[PDB]
Amino acid sequence: KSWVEETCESIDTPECPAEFESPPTLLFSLDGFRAEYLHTWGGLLPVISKLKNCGTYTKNMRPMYPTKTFPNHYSIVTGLYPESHGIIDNKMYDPKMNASFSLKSKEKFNPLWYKGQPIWVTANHQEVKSGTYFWPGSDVEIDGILPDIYKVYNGSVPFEERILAVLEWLQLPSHERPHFYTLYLEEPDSSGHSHGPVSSEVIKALQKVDRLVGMLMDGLKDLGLDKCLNLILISDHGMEQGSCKKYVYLNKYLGDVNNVKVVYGPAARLRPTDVPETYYSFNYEALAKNLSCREPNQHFRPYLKPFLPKRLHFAKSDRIEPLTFYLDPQWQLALNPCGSGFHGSDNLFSNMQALFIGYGPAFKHGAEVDSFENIEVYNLMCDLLGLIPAPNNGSHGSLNHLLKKPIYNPSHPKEEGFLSQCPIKSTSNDLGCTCEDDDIYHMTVPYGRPRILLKQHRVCLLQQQQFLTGYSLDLLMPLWASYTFLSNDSNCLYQDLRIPLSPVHKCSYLSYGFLTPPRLEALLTSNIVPMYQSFQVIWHYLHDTLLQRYAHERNGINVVSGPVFDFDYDGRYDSLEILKQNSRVQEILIPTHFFIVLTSCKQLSETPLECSALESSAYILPHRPDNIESCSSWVEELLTLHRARVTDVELITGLSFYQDRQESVSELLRLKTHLPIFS
Numbered sequence: 067k068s069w070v071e072e073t074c075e076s077i078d079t080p081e082c083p084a085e086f087e088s089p090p091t092l093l094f095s096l097d098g099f100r101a102e103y104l105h106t107w108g109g110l111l112p113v114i115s116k117l118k119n120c121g122t123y124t125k126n127m128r129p130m131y132p133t134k135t136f137p138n139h140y141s142i143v144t145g146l147y148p149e150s151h152g153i154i155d156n157k158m159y160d161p162k163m164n165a166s167f168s169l170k171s172k173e174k175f176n177p178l179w180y181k182g183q184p185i186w187v188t189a190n191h192q193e194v195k196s197g198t199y200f201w202p203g204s205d206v207e208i209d210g211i212l213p214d215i216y217k218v219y220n221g222s223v224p225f226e227e228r229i230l231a232v233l234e235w236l237q238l239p240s241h242e243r244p245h246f247y248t249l250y251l252e253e254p255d256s257s258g259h260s261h262g263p264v265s266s267e268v269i270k271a272l273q274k275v276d277r278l279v280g281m282l283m284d285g286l287k288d289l290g291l292d293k294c295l296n297l298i299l300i301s302d303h304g305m306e307q308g309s310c311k312k313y314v315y316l317n318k319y320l321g322d323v324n325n326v327k328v329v330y331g332p333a334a335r336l337r338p339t340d341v342p343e344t345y346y347s348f349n350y351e352a353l354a355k356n357l358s359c360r361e362p363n364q365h366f367r368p369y370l371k372p373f374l375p376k377r378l379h380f381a382k383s384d385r386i387e388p389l390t391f392y393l394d395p396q397w398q399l400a401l402n403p404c405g406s407g408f409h410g411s412d413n414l415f416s417n418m419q420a421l422f423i424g425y426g427p428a429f430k431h432g433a434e435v436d437s438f439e440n441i442e443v444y445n446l447m448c449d450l451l452g453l454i455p456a457p458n459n460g461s462h463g464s465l466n467h468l469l470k471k472p473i474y475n476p477s478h479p480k481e482e483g484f485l486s487q488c489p490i491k492s493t494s495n496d497l498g499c500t501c502e503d504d505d506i507y508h509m510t511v512p513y514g515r516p517r518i519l520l521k522q523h524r525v526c527l528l529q530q531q532q533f534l535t536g537y538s539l540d541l542l543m544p545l546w547a548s549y550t551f552l553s554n555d556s557n558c559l560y561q562d563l564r565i566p567l568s569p570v571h572k573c574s575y576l577s578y579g580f581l582t583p584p585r586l587e588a589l590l591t592s593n594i595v596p597m598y599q600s601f602q603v604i605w606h607y608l609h610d611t612l613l614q615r616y617a618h619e620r621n622g623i624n625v626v627s628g629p630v631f632d633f634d635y636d637g638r639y640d641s642l643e644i645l646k647q648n649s650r651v652q653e654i655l656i657p658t659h660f661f662i663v664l665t666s667c668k669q670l671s672e673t674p675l676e677c678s679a680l681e682s683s684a685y686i687l688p689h690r691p692d693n694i695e696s697c698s699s700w701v702e703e704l705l706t707l708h709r710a711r712v713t714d715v716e717l718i719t720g721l722s723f724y725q726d727r728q729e730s731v732s733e734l735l736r737l738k739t740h741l742p743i744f745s
């Protein structure tokens with residue numbers, strides 16, 4: 067009887083033969099296996115279904131931007147964002163190197179491109195043998211390390227052969243055998259492209275893919291290993307249906323010119339031809355203004371690197387062309403001339419979502435877990451091979467719930483900020499505008515106050531009746547303001563006597579804006595933030611029309627909001643150095659973004675002051691001085707786009723939320739790494 071034919075066996079302890087000190091781990095990849103493919107055609111795919119059922123599965127695995135092969139596989143194996151690991155796209159150009167990058171190129175094997183540290187390098191650096199069978203970067207001198215077995219990419223190698231050869235290396239002697247393996251298949255991505263994501267072709271592709279996984283599983287059976295190998299079935303990204311009738315051509319807006327090179331598809335980027343002579347010279351900003359709001363329903367949108375949604379993490383690398391285009395589902399873009407299956411879109415689109423299944427002794431049997439970014443996988447792979455992971459973008463421990471016996475028991479980040487209290491100091495002035503505690507504190511910060519990770523920043527906690535403000539004495543402005551807005555609730559300001567009187571405090575004196583809205587003290591100087599007029603339309607609608615609407619839906623919401631200063635667009639909090647170097651002229655420090663974390667309970671009957679389980683959403687909102695970005699409906703539509711993980715917020719603000727929460731550290735991490743999927 068074949069492996070597919072049997073019922074679900076439990077694997078409480080690894081049942082390995084002698085010569086196996088521990089389970090070996092296989093990272094099988096099937097290119098462009100849209101997460102959806104399983105949601106529908108599971109009944110046609112018995113093998114993957116059994117893997118789903120006797121294993122740890124997730125309905126959606128969120129890939130990285132851009133949703134292409136090379137950036138995603140290399141993200142999988144480094145736990146890094148493309149912006150940090152180097153491989154930005156299958157086709158890219160580095161102006162510092164003056165070099166191009168093609169898969170069909172000599173540069174394809176150049177070690178300068180691939181940054182970070184893949185799992186096999188990590189395994190090698192720690193005396194663990196590793197055998198790949200095709201994997202982006204595996205045949206490349208990364209840190210001078212190759213895998214202990216590898217294959218240079220020859221795409222025409224039969225699939226059934228790749229399955230056999232991996233099954234052979236498991237037969238290898240205990241001294242030269244790998245402990246970590248990778249497979250790769252081009253399907254269903256080939257058929258995905260050639261015939262589109264919905265076609266009898268992809269069904270065929272899927273059923274081959276299915277049967278070949280069945281083979282490996284039968285081979286592992288016929289090696290005494292079906293209860294010994296830890297399998298991870300995975301994919302890079304999903305697959306979207308192609309257009310012709312939904313393709314943007316920039317010749318219409320520019321004339322059919324040949325002076326700018328423009329990367330095609332949904333991941334569209336633009337740079338000058340005269341490169342690297344005119345790369346940093348080029349005024350991109352004006353070309354963007356020349357291209358925003360140019361149609362009734364403009365299905366594309368220009369975006370200078372830093373002003374893209376930060377949740378994408380696509381700006382730090384110099385390989386990223388300073389002018390990108392965000393696109394709407396299904397739509398692509400070129401410079402000049404379409405009906406093919408494609409990918410590369412927003413990582414939050416439904417069809418970009420990827421497959422993840424974990425089978426074997428380490429993983430749970432028949433557990434559906436929530437959705438996660440693929441950058442988390444690296445840390446899970448380090449755990450499974452007893453490796454200390456390289457520094458990476460995964461929140462290490464957030465996947466502990468996949469594992470029967472998890473290794474890493476994580477703990478919250480320790481507070482590094484300096485937290486002295488603010489008594490009544492600046493007695494006593496006016497601005498001339500035309501005008502017990504523990505019970506109050508607990509109410510403002512029901513989940514615990516944010517913890518200042520900012521080493522070693524001087525912060526004051528300021529108690530008010532309706533809200534708790536976290537004021538920065540190193541920046542003389544608030545960092546955060548938390549209030550609980552329960553389900554049922556104009557040119558004047560007051561001096562806060564606990565904060566130093568900076569001249570920016572009077573009405574006489576880009577404007578001010580309130581962190582906690584007054585329509586519920588909120589007119590304290592310690593509650594105002596520097597804010598543009600074109601942002602005030604977003605802000606005053608958010609707290610009036612939008613936020614009050616949510617309070618009813620959720621039965622109360624708890625809000626934390628504040629400034630974000632990310633001038634160098636990495637998506638982390640800026641050093642005080644570059645804070646000085648970006649304070650425009652009074653010598654105001656001026657926020658690039660405003661964050662807002664909305665916290666409800668999953669149980670609607672509970673109010674935020676009394677949640678069992680948490681419900682979270684967060685927003686990194688961009689503080690642009692005009693609403694060119696967005697041209698009732700438009701303000702919400704901006705919020706949904708500029709969503710962020712709570713972790714994204716923590717990274718960018720140096721704050722840490724929910725440390726005082728019933729939930730374990732691992733549960734909170736999973737909560738804080740949540741993003742919701744569009745369509």
Ligand SMILES: *[C@@H]1O[C@H](CO)[C@@H](O[C@@H]2O[C@H](CO)[C@@H](O[C@@H]3O[C@H](CO)[C@@H](O)[C@H](O[C@H]4O[C@H](CO)[C@@H](O)[C@H](O)[C@@H]4O)[C@@H]3O)[C@H](O)[C@H]2NC(C)=O)[C@H](O)[C@H]1NC(C)=O
Nearest residue numbers: 146147149150151181182379457458459636637638641717
């Ligand atoms: C995703 O995770 C990665 C991995 O940790 C992380 O990227 C890393 O960020 C740090 C800081 O930006 C990088 O370290 C830098 O290295 C270069 C030289 O190679 C230096 O120029 C930098 O020096 C500054 O920082 C020093 C101390 O921190 C200061 O003393 C000094 O004055 C400089 O200001 C800095 O040391 C590191 O190389 C990267 N690694 C990679 C692989 O990119 C990234 O932040 C994470 N992404 C997100 C969105 O959180």
Ligand SMILES: COc1cc2ncnc(N3CCC(CCP(=O)(O)O)CC3)c2cc1OC
Nearest residue numbers: 134135136156169200201202203204205219
């Ligand atoms: C490390 O050397 C290579 C490893 C590869 N591993 C996986 N897939 C590869 N391909 C390149 C991407 C191709 C898919 C196209 P898409 O980017 O998913 O649109 C399929 C073949 C590799 C291509 C490679 O070199 C060309």
Ligand SMILES: *[C@@H]1O[C@H](CO)[C@@H](O)[C@H](O)[C@H]1NC(C)=O
Nearest residue numbers: 163164165166340341342343
């Ligand atoms: C950069 O490389 C290109 C292509 O190899 C070449 O044409 C050019 O001379 C180089 N230019 C500079 C300015 O280094």
Ligand SMILES: *[C@@H]1O[C@H](CO)[C@@H](O)[C@H](O)[C@H]1NC(C)=O
Nearest residue numbers: 218219220221222223224227
């Ligand atoms: C790729 O592998 C196949 C099967 O072994 C072989 O027939 C073919 O010649 C190989 N191509 C190259 C370029 O090595």
Ligand SMILES: [Ca+2]
Nearest residue numbers: 634638639640
């Ligand atoms: Ca920064």
Ligand SMILES: [Cl-]
Nearest residue numbers: 434435436437
């Ligand atoms: Cl679930």
Ligand SMILES: [Zn+2]
Nearest residue numbers: 097098135302
């Ligand atoms: Zn791919």
Ligand SMILES: [Zn+2]
Nearest residue numbers: 098135255409
């Ligand atoms: Zn593809």
